[PDB]
């Protein structure tokens, strides 16, 4: 029932089944897990690949020496199980030094810092393949209002990226780049906090055609936005360059949830989008197994990530495959969304009576758009109760 | 004490002191007022000028001959009381033919129609001296995934945008526009819900320079966001065209309560950065005198506006004005955060062992930060304790 | 497939499918329904009866003659169709004078009246049959905090809840009260604003016995609560007489949609408890059909909230009989979550050394409660794919 | 100016000024602190006093001989400084036996684990002087549906609060408990999630008078509720046993932010009830530095909690003998809220044709309440700008 393949692309960070349960009001209910165990675990599952922040792989403050060591054991079981690195990033906010922010920290020394250690990563995750490296400023935000001229950080912001944008460039490597948005926490607020600030600080970039969006689920509706409208959003602008998969109860803490739990009906109207839309990027899956769990219910949380993808996928297809569902849609006038609205030009529509002065508002007025009908084909179909 | 002038360019719109007091669970609570009166209540006051969608001045339905008499006695009272008219917009949102949107109605006749309406009312704003013409689509949007494909949508949106902007290049006007966004709330969820979609989606018009935004504080405070962090994107990116000034207490209804209610320390950095900025449109204010009050409290709740604006200001100009308070932001390194990380360039900064190999984080990691004490002379001012 | 009889006892109010789409931005997009027309078409649909406000079935301010014809005409329906009036209800919110509340308005004699208002209703009700008698105070808050002193408002709701209360006893009705809360909308804060404030309000009322709650499924979550949660502290209290079910998408304007709408995990954890519990009163729908909807599309609405309650109740039956799942609760230890903690009594809990003194706190702490497997399996029978 | 005295009564917990400031995405900025040194600096501060958790004070697994020592060096920093010690509490969260809760875990031997703990450190609140003992259920709730039968779980936790109260009563102990709601955090969902939800729990235990409420600022707003309102209920019932003050931004993670950070706006209308109520226990700040800050800062925040309540109460008094704002009072008819509605009895109010047959509605309904005028007021005396 429902078995994932690396076909279907696949992929979980090494933070989030190592997750080891670490909150704010309370201590590790894991231990650590050995990178290398937990690829073997999940091409057992059938995942496609895993991701890595540097400090996940290489423990922070580690010699050349031992940096080697711990790339090659890792390289080691990759080659063992046939296991992929699509995406890479940069931890820039566990250690204190980053408790301001990294590209946009008040002190510049900070700043430099941040913008080396990030390099010396690029140039990891080109080594194992990666073709996405993502960023997700995390510190960047401020609790108090004073502490922080945004203007000056947004300067700040687009230097670092820019210059980024630049060494790839020089280095001839074959990788882009993905802004991941988040609202708040850890601080109180967040620079870029939602898909539609990303989107619009890339445009300002000098090379914006290296860098897109990483959304996630739960981030979105941390500010109670539909995550589908977001992701379309981010598919017309043509910047979808990655994803991250996962579930959310509301406006609260980030939650991290495994992919389907929190809000379901909203989970089936994105895969309904990204399958639709021919997305061809990895389904990565940025969760924590609840802390409650030992380590066969970390492995039961990560499976039920990709069952959940695949049931869902099958219902979508059966949706949009129904040959009720598509009258139903012709019903609604979806058919008419997608034809232009004055392809005649500015002039004809000026001049086209019916369009004005002879066009009858209480008869359209009084069109039912029999929206709630296909919203219940919707429901039994995702319910399997047709 | 505190007396606004016309020099302080505060408007208000038609529909706001005339608001009679309906809401979904209530009949109106108060008559309708002539556009004529309030003209003349709001000069009194110190207005400088007011706002108007077309159906709030020229009832819908209306010949050619009451347009022409409704619009004479409107530029008769501008005439005896010194008022302007800097920003006009359109009613999209009422009429029941609207009731699946204008711009994205899934009726192709009906997105014509909301074309036309709104081509007409650009004409007689011009006539009457705007600047700025400003859209809300309140009903673009959804209730459940299936009514609304939002790609389409989008592609239709730019349409009608790019239409517009041919239309008024074509007749040589002097006006720009404002796209003002909102998270939810006529529909389920609204298209460019936040101030950085809307920024995002400008950029893919034919002629983004005729395009800004329009923020509200309590639109993007219904998403949870930091309503002057959004101002300052805005401003980064050259696209505040004009403001909506009002008060909401959190996520819920848009309450639209007068300026300075609601989020008060979120008000004082607001007009903190405006005026830092030399942000030198009109301030609006788009607020709801609440329906408990009769017309007396209707010209107070108006005049609290204006107050509020002016207290803040004087606030906020003696927070940057005190010596102490421009040593704390030295303290806390705001001036460190203006200047580039990285003026030497790429080359440099990889050569440049102090900022990897031979930096000390743990140093670097002890600094404080220093950011509440500032917070706390920033209360001290607000307060008017020192 | 899943056809509702009129043992099921689903009820609806007349103000559900009688909703004409006024919403604040917008006028009706339906014409007015004859009160006779939705008891006959709801009765074809398979529901078991109806509820009204006072003023959705007699006009504000009928006459006694056109009052009798109205109930005359009512009752005429309900004896044609075998349809019930569970419950009844009084608009104190929709008419001018109770624009600052009912029960709580700070005029007096706008008090006195809202008590007479109701006592007039509560005969009618008792006339017709009702068990219930609900009291939604929606206009009882502020929008400023110097408004309402919050304890003597508290005074005067218990004031005017002990006086119905003395009326029901004088006149031997067996009827009894359900407080519905709310946490805002349309007043900015509405007192008792959740299932835990009411049940807290209604322990300090002369005859307790005589109230319980009605608690609405969108209301507790415009507070981001649970609502299975607050519906068990409900059922534990004793105190869950009525409920109102229906839909929302998080915390925002209460959206009304119909049941299985919003959260739909939610509504499942629902169903399982009604059901495990067994609750036996109505199971009545307070929902709005969407104003983008024709006639057709009201009752197809209506339909569907039956329809996806009848759904959920054979899943959540189909989850409690698995036998993988009564084993997951026993790998869980819902079973002794059951047992007492300290049957033996305090004095024994004090003397027993393997609670404290030989407690092994790391064996117990290794232990994993197994719940993701858990709910993995719920989300399996939700779906329909086990 | 604004100088805090012992006579303010303002305390402090040591896990306050002592947070380290690990978060969940990052490692301590701090080193820890000796309560003997919190003691003397919060001393030297103005503070009146200081609460603990047992394991603040007395390290997990400390032997008896550890044990007494660490009690004896605290109340030697007692004795020197004259500080006292109104509340204490238990850590029932931190370690990882009570992932799944305390008094509500699913196992019963950690339950009865977390009795005994509890026990134990009643003992040594009543040495130490305290007269409150407080409750926070920070891992009583659940993730997901399946994982806690609530029903269950409240009969659990009124088991354990009963069995506690035996205790204290056995004892001869003169301490009440007070029980601290929040809605979630670190739990998906907490039991008990807002005060009206803990006050009706409260009326079901078998000595009801032992038990009140810890409400927190922040907690509450997690929920967007109004705690003015909330502490207005408690105020009501006779139940606020002690009260925590900090600053929230809205509905998102737990902030803890300095007591006037925040919804400033609220704080005034809090410090308003609580000094014209005449509330006489402890002013608690429950707040957490941000980790921004090295140990100049913790004070700085530390020292602004008690001078924003100092400020506040100032402009509370102000504003309420203001002869303007008593005149006010009465035009919005405050004086006639605290009359009783039918001091005359049922009887006489149904005999009174004035509260109905002759009762002019639309003229009561066109009468303003002034609420914005008096709002106005209001704002001027908080910002010294009348
Ligand atoms: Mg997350
Ligand atoms: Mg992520
Ligand atoms: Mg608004
Ligand atoms: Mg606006
Ligand atoms: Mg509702
Ligand atoms: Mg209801
Ligand atoms: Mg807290
Ligand atoms: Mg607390």
């Given at each position: ?8 692309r696949?992929?979980?960070?090494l ?45 922070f ?8 060591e ?112 988040k ?77 389907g ?89 000026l ?8 066009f ?10 029999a ?16």
């Open positions: 029932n429902y078995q994932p393949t690396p076909e279907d696949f992929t979980f960070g933070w989030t089944v190592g997750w080891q349960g670490r909150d704010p009001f309370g201590d590790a209910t894991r231990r650590a897990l050995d990178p290398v165990e937990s690829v073997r675990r999940l091409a057992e599952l059938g995942a496609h690949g895993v991701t890595f922040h540097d400090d996940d792989l290489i423990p403050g580690s010699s050349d020496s031992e940096r080697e711990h790339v090659k054991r890792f390289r080691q079981a990759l080659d063992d199980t046939g296991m992929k690195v699509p995406m890479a990033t940069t931890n820039l906010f566990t250690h204190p030094v980053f408790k301001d922010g990294g590209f946009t920290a008040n002190d510049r020394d900070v700043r430099r810092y941040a913008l080396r250690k990030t390099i010396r990563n690029i140039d990891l995750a080109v080594e194992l393949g990666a073709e996405t490296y993502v960023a997700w400023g995390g510190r960047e935000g401020a609790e108090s209002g004073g502490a922080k001229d945004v203007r000056d950080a947004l300067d700040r912001m687009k230097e670092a990226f820019d210059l980024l944008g630049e060494y790839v460039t020089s280095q001839g490597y074959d990788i882009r780049f993905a802004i991941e948005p609202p708040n926490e850890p601080r109180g607020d967040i620079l870029l906090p939602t898909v539609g600030h990303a989107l619009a600080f890339i445009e300002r970039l000098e090379r914006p055609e290296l860098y897109g969006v990483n959304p996630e689920v739960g981030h979105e509706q941390m500010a109670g936005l539909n995550f589908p409208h977001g992701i379309a959003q981010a598919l017309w602008a043509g910047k979808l360059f990655h994803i991250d998969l996962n579930g959310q109860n509301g406006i609260k803490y980030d939650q991290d949830l495994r992919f739990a929190g809000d379901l009906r909203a989970a089936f109207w994105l895969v309904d989008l990204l399958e639709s839309a021919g997305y061809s990027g990895p389904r990565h899956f940025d969760f924590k197994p609840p802390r409650t769990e030992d380590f066969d219910g970390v492995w039961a949380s990560a499976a039920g990530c990709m069952r959940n993808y695949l049931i869902l996928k099958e219902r979508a297809a059966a949706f949009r495959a129904d040959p009720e569902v598509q009258e139903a849609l012709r019903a609604s006038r979806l058919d008419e969304l997608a034809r232009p609205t004055a392809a005649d030009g500015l002039q004809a529509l001049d086209d009576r019916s369009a004005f002065e002879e009858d508002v209480d008869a359209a007025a009084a069109r039912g758009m929206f709630e009908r296909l919203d219940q084909l919707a429901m039994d179909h995702l319910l399997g109760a047709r």
